[PDB]
Structure 1
Amino acid sequence: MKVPEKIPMKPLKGPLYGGYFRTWHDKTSDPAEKDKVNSMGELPKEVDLAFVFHDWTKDYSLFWQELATKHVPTLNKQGTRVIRTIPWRFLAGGDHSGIAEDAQKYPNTPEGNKALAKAIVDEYVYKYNLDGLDVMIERDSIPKVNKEESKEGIERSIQVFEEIGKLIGPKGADKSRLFIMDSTYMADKNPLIERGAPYIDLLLVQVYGTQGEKGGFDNANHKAVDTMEERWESYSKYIRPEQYMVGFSFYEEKANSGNLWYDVNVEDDTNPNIGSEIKGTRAERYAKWQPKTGGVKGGIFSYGIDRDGVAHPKKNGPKTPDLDKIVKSDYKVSKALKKVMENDKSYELIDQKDFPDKALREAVIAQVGSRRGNLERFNGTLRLDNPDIKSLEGLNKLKKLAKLELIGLSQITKLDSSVLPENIKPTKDTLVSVLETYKNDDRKEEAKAIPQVALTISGLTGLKELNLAGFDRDSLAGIDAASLTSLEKVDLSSNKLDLAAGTENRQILDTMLATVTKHGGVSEKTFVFDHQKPTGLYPDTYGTKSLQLPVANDTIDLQAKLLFGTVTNQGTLINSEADYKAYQEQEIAGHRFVDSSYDYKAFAVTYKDYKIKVTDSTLGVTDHKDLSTSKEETYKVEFFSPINSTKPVHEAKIVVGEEKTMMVNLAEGATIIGGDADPTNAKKVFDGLLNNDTTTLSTSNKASIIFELKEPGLVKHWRFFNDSKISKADYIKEAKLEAFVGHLEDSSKVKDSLEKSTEWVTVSDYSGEAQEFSQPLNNIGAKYWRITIDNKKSQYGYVSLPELQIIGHRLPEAATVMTTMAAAEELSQQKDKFSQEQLKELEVKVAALKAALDNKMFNADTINASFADVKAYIDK
């Protein structure tokens, strides 16, 4: 075969139209299927990108001959590129994987994956001298081995995608070939976008049908999901708006259910040509659709463009077999859709009418884009640092800039609303979507507020008038006042500027004031800054983090003591009405700045929906705000804002009397060893949750758990809960806690008497009817524990246990420490010892380690000394 070399073509320019031509509908594919009447070569010049979509189970060798020798030169001559489409699979190997089926020639190794990428471009692109490669990423093309989805193959396809990107596309060795990704997936579900995005020229999203357009529907919340705007935002992380193309489908002959998109007009006997009309179709809506932010899109594309013009069978009308007949298309829908995008307001060029100043127009064109649609949508930074700019006229046409930077424009004498972006001040979005919506969501659809542009000004050494009044600006940050050596008039009134002394706002304001009073008259009209209503925020950090107070019969309000205050965005703490009136009447050069109307309740934060979590040294927790002092105890107070009850906003330790050490729950995450409780819910007793949503049921009516603390320590307390939501009648009514002393009967170690047959020691024996029970315990160092519970109902009692706590202090191998202090007085129980002249010392210690172990303060240093001291007598 004699493949012609590539003829010259102009660069692709938006708006772009794409079409997927199914190869089995080319005349030349099967000269025996005389019903196949179309030809790829007949596509019109309105088609920028013609994808070859093939049935990989056929040869069609005569078609590839016609493709390479007639159709590609014909299409290239009109500016149309011919793109080879391949399934995702082809980059992975495995089932039906094309070239990659030869795993022995292309092994899954670093060198083999580089060889496979090169073979892929050689075979699917360069063989017929095509213009690029389109990898279709969707459920129907996913890597599979023996019909099952291959996570390994997916991992491999990422490696091979990169390697192809080194050969073609914007980062490839051959930048004349496009590298395209088309996908049905949202970006977070696309396994290849994160690594592949830098390598592709274009990203195509297949959004056929009403579910592509409106999103799917979340029936639990009655809200759309995966909407067209959400899909674009998910990929906006990875590609530029002009790289994004959205796809609809024509009607494929004999389409089954699940292949019925209705993207073109439904048939009508009384207008046999309505299939070729586009007005109001989903395809026309995609031609018209534009994201609300970023920029204008790259274009749209059709699936099954050989069916261009066939009308769509009715959803629930009779069989219409005429539509399933194959006919020669005139490509009329495609030509019209292309004209719709070409003539659309968004794609009009930015020109002198938008920006008169030639040098400004060229900085906007370079950073924002060439299209007027982008003025409406671009939401990044605009840097203006060419001093040759003589007029900032036009910048008002920028609607959603994140940041404006005016740097060293020595020729700009004025700044005000006429030469500033529209969102210098608070504004809402005015674009209106062309898409259908789910009326099954009769909820919002409301014009989202646009964030205000950040304003940076420096080196405007000819700026004479700055007027920013009435804009609700939140700060002056970004104004390098010390370069505005030519200021004569400044107005900053009616904003949200905290100008109180000590703030950086004040410094910028004061430096400007220095510039203007060194100039002429500083009249009541020359430097105005009043009527500021700055925003009251929550203090990031609070004042009191610890309070020692005496044991008294007083109920203290912890929230009034520890949590109050409001803070401006510059750090001005206001705790009170009194504080705020002092603030209201602050002054600059004999003039107040805070607005006279600005009430304290207007400005001031509130703590209505805030939550408190008070925890004592024995781990008892309450959410009571008023705390009593009547009891020698040490607490941990925490406050939680309504928006988040997992991380606290402020915490503080409250000591009543002499401080006790904070104990921990040593049973947290304990391992279930044995007993008759259900193992899954037995685990949940120790995971740490007081009212587990999940079922806490241990058995039907009496249960036991043998368990093992992760890190054994010194136990001083225990606690267990019944779950509220249940009646007292179903509460645990008798409990028995036992510790395993006399370690490991018959031992066996790895072989394990699940301790089911030994002499354990009963540490507690509960008999009551309360929701929560807690009790002090006498210094046990056991690692193995058993609890038995009984709610005293019938055999079908379904006894339940949300949480059990074994509470004390972390002491590594405290059992040996206990075994000694116990054996110490039993080697004073052998008592056949003389040592009376000796042992003033042997006693001044088992009553000093004893006295240090029982001290509310837990000093790990003391006890580890005193214990190692007494076993100096293993030497008698």
Structure 2
Amino acid sequence: MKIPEKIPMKPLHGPLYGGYFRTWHDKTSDPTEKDKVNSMGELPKEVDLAFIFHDWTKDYSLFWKELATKHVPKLNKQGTRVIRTIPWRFLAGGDNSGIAEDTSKYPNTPEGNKALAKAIVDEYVYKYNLDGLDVQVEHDSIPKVDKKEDTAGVERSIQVFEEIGKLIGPKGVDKSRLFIMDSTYMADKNPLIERGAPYINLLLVQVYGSQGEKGGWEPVSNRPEKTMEERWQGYSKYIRPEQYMIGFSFYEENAQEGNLWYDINSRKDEDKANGINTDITGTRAERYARWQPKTGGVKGGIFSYAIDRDGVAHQPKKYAKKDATDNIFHSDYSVSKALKTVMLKDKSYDLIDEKDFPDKALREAVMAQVGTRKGDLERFNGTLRLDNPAIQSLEGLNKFKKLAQLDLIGLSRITKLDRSVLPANMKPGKDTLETVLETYKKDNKEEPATIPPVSLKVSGLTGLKELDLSGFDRETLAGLDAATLTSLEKVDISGNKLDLAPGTENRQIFDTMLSTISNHVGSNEQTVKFDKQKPTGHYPDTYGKTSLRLPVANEKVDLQSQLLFGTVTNQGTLINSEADYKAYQNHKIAGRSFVDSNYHYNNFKVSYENYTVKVTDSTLGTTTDKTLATDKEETYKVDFFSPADKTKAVHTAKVIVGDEKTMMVNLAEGATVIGGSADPVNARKVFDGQLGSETDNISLGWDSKQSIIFKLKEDGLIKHWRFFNDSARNPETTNKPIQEASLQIFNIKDYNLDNLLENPNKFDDEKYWITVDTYSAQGERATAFSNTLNNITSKYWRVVFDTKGDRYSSPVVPELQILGYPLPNADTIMKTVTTAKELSQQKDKFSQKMLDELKIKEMALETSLNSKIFDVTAINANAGVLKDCIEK
């Protein structure tokens, strides 16, 4: 085989069209077949990139000869590059890797990977003098070991990809050979793109079918996902828009169910004898030819899979479950030529020239930093840094529609900056580009995206005489290095959204410009304009009122109006009230207000209307009413929540109505279950400090009545209890409510605790317990019950929950709370109260004076034990005084 000398070709210049020609459809591939009438050499000049798509199980030696000696020179002569496509798995060792199976020649070392890269280009590029290499990064081609996807192989393939890139592609020794990646992944899922992208000329992404085009519908957000724009946005982090190409597929003969894309037109149902349709009209392919990113810039182009089937009509969708469309036809590549013709009609590709930017230094910066196409000006949303002091005119900058950041640095020749020489997105606005794709909504009309206004940095413009930023609704002056604008004689920043209050960053920038103008030409209403501001109101980051004290009275207070208020500017000025906003309007600059006279407190302030609250009382009962009635003496914790997160409080405050009461803790959280006729694993979830999910089974057991025997973790003085019905967890629960309940404490004065602990089931009867409260349901919907309890002291408890229902009406209780204050030795303390009471009865043994004295000490202890503010210290003190008086 004499390999002919490479015919030189011009540099790649978009928009480009590529196509994947299947080797088993070249007529030279397998002489023994009759149906094979196509030839890769016949691809027309409209094809920029002809990819060889081969079946690795096949030899086709005669095709390789025809390809190397005939197709490549013919195709190169007309401008078409021929690219060899290989799978991901060739770039590491493992199953079916081919060259890398030789582990002695190509070990997984730096020398070995380098050797492997060379072997790969030697074989797939230079052997037939081809124009490039295309690696398929698709999960079907991933490295495997013993049919298992292999992490070591994936990591290896990245290093090998880099080594191939040192040989070919834009960073390689031989830049005349292209290095291409084609991928089915979204960028954030593609393991090779981060380290691989600097080495490739182009990235091809397959987007066949309606789902490639529109994305998929996601029902629980009611929104498309993986849309064409989203796939591009992910890749935009790694490659330039001109390197991006999107692909559709032709109809493959005999295609199966998961390979039916309908990207080109179908055979007419009744046109049974027609296998052909070369019409581009209304095809996904023709929409792809015209599609452009809404941001970044205009695309590299499009490609097709199975170009050997160009013009073959798609099999009708009806028969997707013997068609003319399944025959083999000789293509003339009419569809490909028509799609290239559509792209060449796209004026987005006209070159940026001296009519866009007449200043050659500015024009050169744009071309270097932005791109070379007029369509890029409409889309580019990154940074343009203009720090070449040669720049003498900024004419043209208004052609930027979406630029994110503009730096004007040291441009000492520039004498004026205003609307006419600044980006079109100095002011707010929405996307005006229109989609050419189908969408899931009405008439393919999507919600225009907001364009963020450009951020502007200006420093060292020492020749600048006029700065007019008027009427742009600018949010800040941040970026204006005022101390360096030493020539300024006129400034207008009126009609923006600037907070210019004394002390702010904006005011400091302004005052600096003001001194400069004042010293040059004088500050007056002509040379200095700054009013009609409408500064944006934001939510403060934190809130300062963390306590509210209210008398007991017949009133209702709005917690939000009392606790959660305030609007702040982006400059940090806080306006808590109408009064503050009046004082803000009071601010004068050279005698006049800077705030717009039509911008009142109501247009400025943020709204707290959809904020929510959780109000928790001293006994841990909860409501969500924004309004609190003050007729009851009670102490509360109040949490406020943004609509954006009903789980993270943005502010918390304590509200005290009447005299402060200590918040109780739930003394039964973490309680230990030791008995009761009822599932111990579920029983414990009544103590787990959460309602639970309705995914979790929290049923106590089978029959309708269930006990739980338990021990508190800590010694406490118990003053309340609460249990929840299942409706507290799910309001729609089919679980009946507790009709009957009993809370009981163990009778350690008639029975031995050691007996309870040794056989808890023996003790699972009322006779051995003392009932301290009983609930019987009134009838109406109640998500919970709570009741006071009188200074109960007990380590061991029993609870009985009964739904009173029939079979399958299991008591379901999200949580059981036993509330109090912790109090170590509480039994001992209450035992002394009990002894003092006993003594006070022995009216023959003790005189009235002894008893009166003992009474005073008993009262002092009782007073402290029930004090609103609970104090273990004072309780302990009074308890020792009473114990002493007990002797005797």
Residues 636 and 123 (structure 1 numbering): CA distance in 2 closer, same or farther, change over 3 Å? farther
Match of 1:641 in 2: 642
Residues 72 and 578 (structure 1 numbering): CA distance in 2 closer, same or farther, change over 3 Å? same
Distance 1:114 1:809 in 2: 72
What is the letter of the counterpart of residue 155 of structure 2?
Q
Which of 805, 817, 829 does residue 793 from structure 1 map onto?
805
- Which region of structure 1 is more displaced relative to structure 2, 652-661 or 405-414? 652-661
Offset, 1:226: 2.9
What is the letter of the counterpart of residue 283 of structure 1?
A
Residues 663 and 295 (structure 1 numbering): CA distance in 2 closer, same or farther, change over 3 Å? farther
What is the letter of the counterpart of residue 168 of structure 1?
I
Match of 1:732 in 2: 738
Structure 1 SS opposite 2:637: strand
Distance 2:498 2:604 in 1: 13
Which of 323, 329, 332 does residue 331 from structure 2 map onto?
329
Distance 2:650 2:570 in 1: 17
Structure 2 SS opposite 1:470: coil
What is the letter of the counterpart of residue 806 of structure 2?
S
**Contact in 1 for aligned 2:162/2:195 (Cα 8 Å):** no
- Which region of structure 1 is more displaced relative to structure 2, 696-705 or 230-239? 696-705
Residues 860 and 507 (structure 1 numbering): CA distance in 2 closer, same or farther, change over 3 Å? farther
Offset, 1:721: 1.2
Structure 2 SS opposite 1:231: helix
Offset, 1:279: 4.4
What is the letter of the counterpart of residue 209 of structure 1?
G
What is the letter of the counterpart of residue 48 of structure 1?
D
TM superposition score normalised by structure 2? 0.81
Match of 1:768 in 2: 776
Offset, 1:566: 2.1
Distance 2:369 2:873 in 1: 65
**Contact in 1 for aligned 2:676/2:760 (Cα 8 Å):** no
Which of 362, 384, 404 does residue 382 from structure 1 map onto?
384
Distance 1:718 1:196 in 2: 64
Matched, 1:355 2:357: yes
Distance 1:676 1:127 in 2: 82
Structure 2 SS opposite 1:382: strand
Match of 1:458 in 2: 459
Matched, 1:514 2:515: yes
Residues 319 and 685 (structure 1 numbering): CA distance in 2 closer, same or farther, change over 3 Å? closer
| Bigger radius of gyration among the two | 2
Match of 2:846 in 1: none
Offset, 1:638: 1.3
Distance 1:674 1:199 in 2: 69
What is the letter of the counterpart of residue 158 of structure 2?
E
Distance 1:822 1:171 in 2: 86
Match of 1:294 in 2: 296
Offset, 1:711: 7.9
- Which region of structure 1 is more displaced relative to structure 2, 331-340 or 680-689? 680-689
Offset, 1:350: 0.9
Distance 1:736 1:108 in 2: 72
Distance 1:319 1:625 in 2: 60
Match of 2:577 in 1: 576
Distance 2:567 2:433 in 1: 37
Offset, 1:330: 2.7
Map 1:449-528; keep pairs closer than 5 Å: 449-528=450-529
Matched, 1:162 2:158: yes
Map 1:380-459; keep pairs closer than 5 Å: 380-438=382-440, 441=442, 445-459=446-460
Cα distance per residue 1:338-373 (max 9 Å; x no partner): 343234212111110100000000111111111111
Cα distance per residue 1:638-659 (max 9 Å; x no partner): 1112232121221123345675
Map 1:7-156; keep pairs closer than 5 Å: 10-68=10-68, 70-72=70-72, 75=75, 80-88=80-88, 130-138=130-138, 140-141=140-141, 150=148, 153=149, 155-156=151-152
Residues 318 and 623 (structure 1 numbering): CA distance in 2 closer, same or farther, change over 3 Å? closer
Distance 1:578 1:825 in 2: 57
Residues 799 and 110 (structure 1 numbering): CA distance in 2 closer, same or farther, change over 3 Å? farther
- Which region of structure 1 is more displaced relative to structure 2, 361-370 or 602-611? 602-611
Distance 1:373 1:275 in 2: 32
Distance 2:261 2:138 in 1: 17
**Contact in 1 for aligned 2:158/2:192 (Cα 8 Å):** no
Map 1:480-629; keep pairs closer than 5 Å: 480-547=481-548, 555-628=556-629
Offset, 1:89: 5.4
Percentage of identical aligned residues = 66
What is the letter of the counterpart of residue 473 of structure 2?
D
What is the letter of the counterpart of residue 486 of structure 1?
S
Matched, 1:247 2:247: yes
Distance 2:366 2:555 in 1: 68
What is the letter of the counterpart of residue 327 of structure 2?
K
What is the letter of the counterpart of residue 800 of structure 1?
V
Residues 46 and 715 (structure 1 numbering): CA distance in 2 closer, same or farther, change over 3 Å? farther
Cα distance per residue 1:690-747 (max 9 Å; x no partner): 4845476625552648699998785856432111536999311233567899999899
Distance 1:852 1:611 in 2: 37
- Which region of structure 1 is more displaced relative to structure 2, 617-626 or 581-590? 617-626
Structure 2 SS opposite 1:536: coil
TM superposition score normalised by structure 1? 0.82
**Count of residues in Structure 1 that have an aligned counterpart in Structure 2:** 836
Distance 1:745 1:382 in 2: 83
- Which region of structure 1 is more displaced relative to structure 2, 255-264 or 523-532? 255-264
Residues 481 and 82 (structure 1 numbering): CA distance in 2 closer, same or farther, change over 3 Å? same
Structure 2 SS opposite 1:508: helix
Residues 847 and 222 (structure 1 numbering): CA distance in 2 closer, same or farther, change over 3 Å? closer
What is the letter of the counterpart of residue 287 of structure 1?
A
Offset, 1:374: 0.7
Distance 1:785 1:102 in 2: 74
**Contact in 1 for aligned 2:182/2:205 (Cα 8 Å):** yes
Matched, 1:802 2:810: no
Unaligned runs of 5+ in 1: 748-752, 829-845, 868-876
**Contact in 2 for aligned 1:158/1:195 (Cα 8 Å):** no
Distance 1:316 1:24 in 2: 29
Offset, 1:378: 0.4
**Contact in 1 for aligned 2:554/2:629 (Cα 8 Å):** yes
Match of 1:209 in 2: 209
Matched, 1:721 2:729: no
Match of 1:838 in 2: none
Distance 2:397 2:298 in 1: 19
**Contact in 2 for aligned 1:214/1:436 (Cα 8 Å):** yes
Distance 1:111 1:819 in 2: 78
Residues 603 and 359 (structure 1 numbering): CA distance in 2 closer, same or farther, change over 3 Å? same
- Which region of structure 1 is more displaced relative to structure 2, 850-859 or 137-146? 850-859
- Aligned-residue Cα RMSD (Å) equals 4.7
What is the letter of the counterpart of residue 793 of structure 1?
G
Offset, 1:572: 2.5
Offset, 1:160: 2.7
Residues 201 and 617 (structure 1 numbering): CA distance in 2 closer, same or farther, change over 3 Å? farther
- Which region of structure 1 is more displaced relative to structure 2, 12-21 or 398-407? 12-21
Residues 665 and 270 (structure 1 numbering): CA distance in 2 closer, same or farther, change over 3 Å? same
Residues 363 and 727 (structure 1 numbering): CA distance in 2 closer, same or farther, change over 3 Å? closer
Offset, 1:478: 1.0
What is the letter of the counterpart of residue 653 of structure 1?
K
Cα distance per residue 1:444-481 (max 9 Å; x no partner): 62333311111111111111111121111111111111
